[PDB]
Chain A
Amino acid sequence: SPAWTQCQQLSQKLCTLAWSAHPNDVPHIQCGDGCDPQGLRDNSQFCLQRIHQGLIFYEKLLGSDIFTGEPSLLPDSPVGQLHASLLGLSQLLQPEGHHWETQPWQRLLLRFKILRSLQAFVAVAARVFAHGAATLSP
């Protein structure tokens, strides 16, 4: 149902961009979410829905005040393409008929904390789509 090879290509680009940018209530790919190899065989919809939930989560943060305002991101910063690739991959995971979409200046620390958490998330997502494209594909 999902374009596995397209998702593999986009998720691989996400890992590259996530590390080019940065060389509690957060969604995580937990153990019971079925993103392991055996879980993807039984049913991949559970994992792919969790991945989609994390993608829209990080997409909102990258477009929020945390990253839009100052200190202004360098004109050639990888965050711009990173936000676009997050939206590009989450769009590929939304099937028809389903609607899954649902103070101090020292907050540069939060920027690096979000991107560090993002690097871990897209790493697991990239492994899921690379494994699915290699096994769950015609």
Chain B
Amino acid sequence: LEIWELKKDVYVVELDWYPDAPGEMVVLTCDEDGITWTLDQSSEVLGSGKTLTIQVKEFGDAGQYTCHKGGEVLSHSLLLLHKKEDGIWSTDILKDQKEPKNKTFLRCEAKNYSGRFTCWWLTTISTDLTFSVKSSRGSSDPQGVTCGAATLSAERVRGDNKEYEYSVECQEDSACPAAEESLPIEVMVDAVHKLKYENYTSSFFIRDIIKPDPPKNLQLKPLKSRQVEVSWEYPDTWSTPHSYFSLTFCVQVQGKKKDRVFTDKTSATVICRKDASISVRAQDRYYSSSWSEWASVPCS
């Protein structure tokens, strides 16, 4: 319906916005005399009885409605607006990262095939924000995915204004790391800024958002010339066993030219030089997902 329950005593009113739009007719209910109705914190009484009918046309009609009996509050009803213009719902709370594709508001990442992943999103708003995250694998017959609470994770200054980063951790309830995914994971995020309601969705396979941790224990062992034996290990967070979930690596010798070597072993022999570094990063060997961050160690 055009009005529906989001949470207990919280209701979303879908508003088709255009000049002189009629809005929606909302009927309320109080969970028998003196039953006056107020809006926010004004004593101006707007109705009596268990039911109250109001025409919601703008944000001024949204807010917290309260049925009052004899100076005693009995129930509350919060009305949020989901604004729709020319067919598109508003997306003003979250910033469009616009990569990898346009209209990308949520970006997610996984370090292994365990079914655990993290999703991030950005906003220029600093207060009065409420986020709620839900997830599932499949849409028809949804499989269980459990998400934690969305929290403020970072705060950067981009231009004059400040960017606020929020993150959430989710885990597929019954994950199968080795199976070939056929149904994508869906992530759904409700966003509330004061009286404005919006929501955002992201759909992906775990294999497509893989980004391994950097190679660990990167060491150098000179030989006698400029040759040096480079060695490293799989990261601790990567899926096991490694004979199944194999990684491939890129070894780089760079000074502040670029000599790059691609290998499947955890070791290599390169040539060092003055004020140059040896860097190694990892990637799923059999599926071209994201490269890991560089793990680096200086020569000599």
Interfacial residues, chain A to chain B (CB-CB below 8 A): 12, 15, 19, 23, 26, 28-31, 33, 35-37, 119-124, 126-128, 130-131, 134-135
Contact present for B241 and A123 (CB under 8 Å): no
C-alpha gap A29/B182 in the complex (Å): 9
Q: List 10 A-B pairs, Cβ < 8 Å.
A: A15-B286, A28-B179, A29-B179, A31-B176, A33-B179, A35-B178, A37-B178, A121-B180, A122-B286, A130-B246
Contact present for B180 and A131 (CB under 8 Å): no
Number of interface residues of B (CB under 8 A): 19
Contact present for B181 and A36 (CB under 8 Å): no
Contact present for B243 and A130 (CB under 8 Å): yes
Q: Residues of A contacting B57 with CB < 8 Å?
A: none
Interfacial residues, chain B to chain A (CB-CB below 8 A): 176-182, 205, 207, 241, 243-246, 284-288
Contact present for A124 and B180 (CB under 8 Å): yes
A119 CB to nearest B CB, Å: 7
Contact present for A36 and B287 (CB under 8 Å): no
C-alpha gap A131/B205 in the complex (Å): 23
Contact present for B286 and A127 (CB under 8 Å): yes
Closest to B175 in A: A31
Contact present for B245 and A127 (CB under 8 Å): yes
Q: Residues of A contacting B178 with CB < 8 Å?
A: 31, 35-37, 124, 127
B241 CB to nearest A CB, Å: 6
Contact present for A15 and B287 (CB under 8 Å): yes
Known: A31-B176, A31-B179, A35-B179. A134 touches B288 (CB 8 A): no
Closest to A122 in B: B286
Q: Residues of A contacting B182 with CB < 8 Å?
A: 26, 28, 30
